[PDB]
């Protein structure tokens, strides 16, 4: 009933090395060598059981927090969140907070988002992509466009007059760099007096100082009468099941969580999308994206992007499908849980790996081939946005952003990969994207 | 117009060594060799101007936050208050929060307290001081008594059905374990994971989970029973809005933290002085005062009708003040007598020092409850001015109920020649715990 452990060859470290050197190869190798889709690996002394069979995805995504907990495994994120916030808070309270954000990101809030986005893309374009052909780093540029377009959508004008996208990014970077992802396996690390923790602290107390100055100016305004909502006001008016409103630091915590969530996954999804579409091997697909946009006004609207872009959407999904930005979703097992024909014991870190599952040959024939036209051959094998009790809550907003960019970008430009092949993914980051140094691309305006 | 700085002779560290070795003696030595009550020391390179002349106290206490600020210096309190609460919030909002607590501790709320307190004290003595004679640590027992009474007064029955005094005391202890008082002088220490750093955060999230569950049960029955929690839940900031659970919680633990230590120390000192043979005269005085009351005390009895017990508690804080050194960051140049204290200095006024100026307090090391300040405003054991203590009433109400109930039924023998030495190594100073073994004798 215990799933097969893969033979340890390297004393205390376990497989931490041959994992990080090549996560996909190493997992595939495991799946084969143990003639089994469900297996256990060792990472610095900790048992990590991987649910690598797509037919078993529901055994990971559906059990409740009390059985499969995210708290313990995602605690290295307390820099982003703040100390008693998101996964660090009790489950009832965690749920309320994420629900408040979730309702702040529903399609019902997008009435004004497409123009917000389009404005910010064009403004980036007509300041950095403004020659008749130039050389840029595409990941970096998309990454900048996405932070700007996210702020424009979710921050009101009063907010952005004090805290523009450039300054939010800068603060966010300072907090982001405090993250030690190895802490999932070596929690001792979260106790080291590292100097990148002072920097994170300093940026958080600066973010809160500014938001507080904003809330005061908002309340002064509201007495002399009284209008226009955003992420902030929205959270600012959430009431918990108990009597009480959120505190500044929880409001702020959810804001930085929302923006960090979006910044990387969406950029990378955009970057990959465009790298794929620009590749000469996918002319047929580029052509299809162009036929899709062909009849659109210069100023797109809600319906253009939500309801009339199913081929750009497939492009995003497929990009995520082939090169998932989140490689391993994780939970600490709190009770023996059945999985396949196996029992996974209390104390195991249990993972489900979009990387591994999205390259299952039954589920996704020719996995390294990018093919928007495709569909999963096994039910619920695509888990790029997760599933279950912790489904991505920003999926729609993310894709709204990827699509609108693809739309605006390709309308006005072509691109040339300065390279024979699409970039190698770079697994050495917390959120995975194409290799930065390989993402230089020549833009070309359009006659 | 600068105050005179004491010669530095240990580079980097400054005077920290020679201050921590003897806070009082070092300070008086400066006060002497510069022939000045106002002077400047150096603590790990940070300027500290002590206002050590009781005549000039008001130049520390009266100015408002915007000139002499407590925020930067009392930041290190975050583990107790929570992020962005009390000393961590913007001035107005802090002021407001502390006014909400103030209103929860005024004399009006004390209607029920005395037979609650006295029930907890008696309950304690009937279980632990239960033989004709026995040995106990008096500091530990006073601490337990103070935690048990403060909870009985400030927490409803329903709250205490989830959290007894034992369990609250633990969680308070886990929060205080993350306090790093040296952070007054090394703020980096507030921005760093240290190994104790997580402890307060686990306790806090526990407490808040409990308060939330209690509140929900409180609102499920709401379709008497007023307490601290319901007080704060009903508070409305000067703008439209209420407190978050996080602030409410912060103010609750701030309150119990403040009261737990200072009151326990005050009681223990008081009982220690009163039990010493050299103070027999004063013990008889306290008994003549107590002898005139019923067995069952009331609000008026201990508040308005016990001026000698109150004198004993005050003279204890006078001799061995629990808070040695009160501080503010100087935000704008301030004149202090003759002398300008420059912007960016830490300005401090020390109750230890002032209560030992001979002009204000002759024979300062003698405990004499009969004495009075000979300089107006010299006693600052409870602070003064914009930040004067708001829990003083409640603190002394507990101390005095304990003194009356304790000496009515018991005598005590100090297992030692002398009143204990104060131990200056804790953040809220009390007598040395190991010197506090005492023998209780049940009377007639
Ligand atoms: C010397 C040896 C050396 C080499 C081997 O030589 N070496 N030494 C050490 N390592 C090493 C180092 C690190 C690792 N990683 C461990 C960390 N893992 C990881 C990744 C992502 C995670 O994300 C968690 C949440 C889920 O969703 C997000 C994101 N999101 C959702 N929507 C949009 N974004 C989310 C949720 C909610 C929110 F509100 C917000 C959010 F963002 C974040 C969690 C864990 C990857 C592997 C492995 C090995 C080595 O390689
Ligand atoms: C080397 C290993 C390390 C670790 C720790 O082992 N370590 N080892 C030793 N030291 C160490 C120890 C001490 C010092 N000094 C001692 C003098 N200082 C000091 C400053 C401010 C204080 O009080 C601030 C407020 C004022 O009022 C209170 C209290 N209150 C009001 N009413 C009733 N109580 C208040 C107010 C409002 C509320 F709502 C609540 C409250 F409580 C709290 C008190 C003392 C710090 C510097 C330096 C270093 C270490 O750091
Ligand atoms: C567009 C690319 C995105 C991808 C590929 C993505 C991916 C994911 C995945 C795989 C999960 C599962 C987490 C787990 O099981 O541990 C997740 C959850 C989550 N995502 Fe996303 N996400 C994206 C965009 C966004 C955006 C824009 C937001 C906006 C804030 C967001 C916020 C969240 C949150 C808060 C959760 C966790 C909710 C919970 O624990 O219930 N994501 N996302
Ligand atoms: C014998 C018992 C007590 C003593 C000896 C004492 C002493 C003091 C002192 C010296 C200050 C001045 C702080 C400064 O100037 O920096 C102060 C302030 C304060 N005390 Fe106490 N105190 C006692 C009891 C309490 C209790 C029981 C509470 C709450 C229940 C309390 C709450 C406060 C608060 C909230 C402040 C200052 C807030 C502000 O900055 O305005 N005290 N106390």
Author numbering:
A (entry chain D): 30 to 254, 256 to 477
B (entry chain B): 30 to 252, 257 to 477
From the reporting publication:
Trypansoma cruzi, the protozoan agent of Chagas Disease, is closely related to two other major global pathogens, Leishmania spp., responsible for leishmaniasis, and Trypansoma brucei, the causative agent of African Sleeping Sickness. Both T. cruzi and Leishmania parasites have an essential requirement for ergosterol, and are thus vulnerable to inhibitors of sterol 14α-demethylase (CYP51), which catalyzes the conversion of lanosterol to ergosterol. Here we report the crystal structures for the CYP51 target in T. cruzi (CYP51Tc) (resolutions 2.35 Å and 2.27 Å) and that of the closely related CYP51 ortholog from Trypanosoma brucei (CYP51Tb) (resolutions 2.7 Å and 2.6 Å), each bound to an anti-fungal triazole drug, either fluconazole or posaconazole. Nevertheless, CYP51Tc and CYP51Tb do share 83% sequence identity, a fact which has been crucial for successfully determining their crystal structures and makes it possible to extrapolate structural features learned from one enzyme toward the other.
The hydrophobic tunnel in CYP51Tb accommodates the antifungal drug posaconazole in either extended or bent conformations. The 2.6 Å structure of the CYP51Tb-posaconazole complex revealed four protein monomers in an asymmetric unit with posaconazole coordinating to the heme iron in a manner similar to that of fluconazole with the fluorinated edge of the 2,4-difluorophenyl ring facing away from the heme macrocycle, and the long substituent tail extending into the hydrophobic tunnel. In the CYP51Tb-posaconazole structure, four protein molecules in the asymmetric unit superimpose with the r.m.s.d. within of 0.5 Å, revealing virtually no conformational variations. However, posaconazole samples two distinct conformations due to the long tail swinging ∼7–8 Å in the hydrophobic mouth of the substrate binding tunnel. Three from the four monomers (chains A, B, and C) accommodate posaconazole in bent conformation while in the monomer D posaconazole is in extended conformation. Conformational variability of posaconazole is enabled by the interconversion of the piperazine six-membered ring between the chair and twisted boat conformations. The latter serves to accommodate the bend. Electron density is best defined in monomer B, where the terminal phenyl-2-hydroxypentan-triazolone group of posaconazole lies within 6 Å of protein residues I209-P210-A211 and V213-F214 which are invariant between CYP51Tc and CYP51Tb. In the extended conformation in monomer D, the phenyl-2-hydroxypentan-triazolone group swings toward residues I45-I46.,.The scattered Fo-Fc electron density map in the monomers A and D suggests possible interconversion of the posaconazole conformers in dynamic equilibrium, meaning that the phenyl-2-hydroxypentan-triazolone group dangles in space within the tunnel mouth.
